[PDB]
Write a protein that binds this ligand. Structure first.
Ligand SMILES: CNC(=O)c1nn(C)c2c1C(C)(C)Cc1cnc(Nc3ccc(N4CCN(C)CC4)cc3)nc1-2
Lengths: 257, 302
């Protein structure tokens, strides 16, 4: 691509601005990481049901972390927030969103259509209509153009790891999307092809393998423990042949770092 | 939100369509003249329309002299207003009012130059416009032209997929789209601009098709039917048929007779069949055609 570089530079600037407050969850009186984990897992499931793009999913989560970063929410409302987030993410990214009715259905009519629309309004107000946020997905895409031989298994496994990082606010709130993507990419490349974070991406991103290390370690750990994790929708999603069954792939025992 | 709306004096309707309505309006407190777009938010009961979601979020990242500025958003319970900087006229009407005389070539150059600058800004911020047509290009008395109507615009940090119901009007539609390509790329906007460039120069639309197939054939008849050597992949593309007539490329000096060598060169590169090879907005800005560009003012018949 011809703007490939300008766009990267720009996504790298926006990801700093559209970044949630790292410590927001401990300032929430009533909800917790575990509840957010359950919400995001549920949204992955919803994305699978309505056959939504992965980008939608990542956007929805970004909206949620930003909303919760400045608005106190109670357990019984967390899902209404996430439902509205998903609706907005769909409206933004999907060729055409599911109907509102569908987002009321997926909640077991826990909420009325009216509550969903009003929450969508509130989320838009709180995010100030700033919906075009950088995501792990977007950086992964930029990164993929840098496989000398393009490998579809590496791309699925990188998507899979990037998608898992959405689930656990600890420790992944503390990392930029570009960094999580860098670590997910190298880790997937390493597991599948045995190759490492390529020099061409070092020059492009300014990230060294050294620089990715802390996120790598965490991501590798999440990869190892994935089958044990309390949330499983993503592993399920990624054992489908659409993703080359990459969640069945065995993680390396150690990284050669 | 309701006080904001009360600060606006509606002057006159300047635009209407499926989206809603646009008024010239005046801020009663500051005197600022403004374009007020009203989106009707009860018409479907589907929440804020996706077009509005995309236009708003994308337009507030895009602050550039050649992109119509979104100044404000007012979201009440049942109404959504967008406040845009106000321009005087759209290019479609201007071209039509210029039929007898033609748009002077220096002004054509200035316009294309500004549109390219505006487009390059969009693309270098991962926004595809996707609806570039004369009526969505707005002009003022000072000689500026600016991109408007981002109702179909999309961010492409992740590739944008093709949709049957959300495409440019036929005349300005790129051949990839007509041939059923999977993803949009920046090249579709460059194609539209090239068509518009040609239309300003000749006073006729370049490729005024009656249908999708007729549109392709008008393109083939002028630029020649594309083959594997011109456009690696054409024959594999979904809506490509081997039964397509094979036309030879018309002589380009006869397609845009008023244009000199530089103009013919620029337009050729903007109408390159292969999307990967079609010139980018940024590279077009550097073309020798714009060596001598100035900023003439139009004669706006108002
Ligand atoms: C989907 N379209 C729009 O949102 C839109 N349409 N128009 C015409 C405008 C918009 C925006 C995005 C809200 C911004 C804007 C900003 N300025 C103008 N100015 C303007 C003034 C007069 C005319 N006319 C020429 C054609 N006519 C005979 C009616 C008057 C056209 C545009 N128009 C507009």
């Amino acid at each position: 691509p011809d703007y490939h570089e300008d766009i990267h530079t720009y996504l790298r600037e926006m990801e700093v601005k559209c970044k949630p407050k790292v410590g927001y969850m401990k300032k929430q009186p009533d909800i917790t990481n575990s509840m957010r984990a359950i919400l995001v897992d549920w949204l992955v499931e919803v994305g699978e049901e309505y056959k939504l793009q992965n980008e939608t999913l990542h956007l929805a989560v970004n909206y949620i972390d930003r909303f919760l970063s400045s608005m106190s929410v109670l357990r019984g409302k967390l899902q209404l927030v996430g439902t509205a987030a998903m609706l907005l993410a769909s409206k933004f990214e999907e060729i055409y969103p599911p109907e509102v009715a569908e987002f009321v259905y997926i909640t077991d009519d826990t909420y009325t259509k009216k509550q969903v629309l009003r929450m969508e309004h509130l989320v838009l107000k709180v995010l100030t209509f700033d919906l075009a946020a950088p995501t792990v997905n977007q950086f992964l895409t930029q990164y993929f153009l840098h496989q000398q031989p393009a490998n579809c298994k590496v791309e699925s496994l990188a998507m899979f790891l990037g998608e898992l990082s959405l689930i656990d606010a600890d420790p992944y709130l503390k990392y930029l999307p570009s960094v999580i993507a860098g670590a997910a990419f190298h880790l997937a490349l390493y597991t599948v092809t045995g190759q490492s974070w390529p020099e061409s991406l070092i020059r492009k991103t300014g990230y060294t393998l050294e620089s990715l290390k802390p996120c790598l370690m965490d991501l590798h750990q999440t990869y190892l423990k994935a089958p044990q994790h309390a949330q499983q929708s993503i592993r399920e999603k990624y054992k489908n042949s659409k993703y080359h069954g990459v969640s069945l792939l065995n993680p390396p025992e150690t990284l050669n770092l | 939100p309701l006080v904001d709306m009360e600060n606006f004096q509606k002057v006159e309707k300047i635009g209407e369509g499926t989206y809603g309505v646009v008024y010239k309006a005046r801020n009663k407190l500051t005197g600022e003249v403004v374009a007020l777009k009203k989106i009707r938010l009860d018409t479907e009961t589907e929440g804020v329309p996706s077009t509005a979601i995309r236009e708003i979020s994308l337009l507030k990242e895009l602050n550039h002299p050649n992109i119509v500025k979104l100044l404000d958003v007012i979201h009440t319970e049942n109404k959504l207003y967008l406040v845009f900087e106000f321009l005087h006229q759209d290019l479609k009407k201007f071209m039509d009012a210029s039929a007898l005389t033609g748009i002077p070539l220096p002004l054509i150059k200035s316009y294309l130059f500004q549109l390219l600058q505006g487009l390059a800004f969009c693309h270098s911020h991962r926004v595809l416009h996707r609806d570039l047509k004369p009526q969505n290009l707005l002009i003022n008395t000072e000689g500026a032209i600016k991109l408007a109507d981002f109702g179909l615009a999309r961010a492409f940090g992740v590739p944008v997929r093709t949709y049957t119901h959300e495409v440019v009007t036929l005349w300005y539609r790129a051949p990839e789209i007509l041939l059923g390509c999977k993803y949009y790329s920046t090249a579709v906007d460059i194609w539209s601009l090239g068509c518009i460039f040609a239309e300003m120069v000749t006073r006729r639309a370049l490729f005024p098709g009656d249908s999708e197939i007729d549109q392709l054939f008008r393109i083939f008849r002028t630029l020649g039917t594309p083959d594997e050597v011109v456009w690696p992949g054409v024959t594999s593309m979904p809506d490509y048929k081997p039964s397509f007539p094979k036309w030879a490329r018309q002589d380009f000096s006869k397609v845009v007779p008023p244009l000199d060598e530089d103009g013919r060169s620029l337009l050729s590169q903007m109408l390159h069949y292969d999307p990967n090879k079609r010139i980018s907005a940024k590279a077009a800005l550097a073309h020798p055609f714009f060596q001598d560009v100035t900023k003439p003012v139009p004669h706006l018949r108002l």
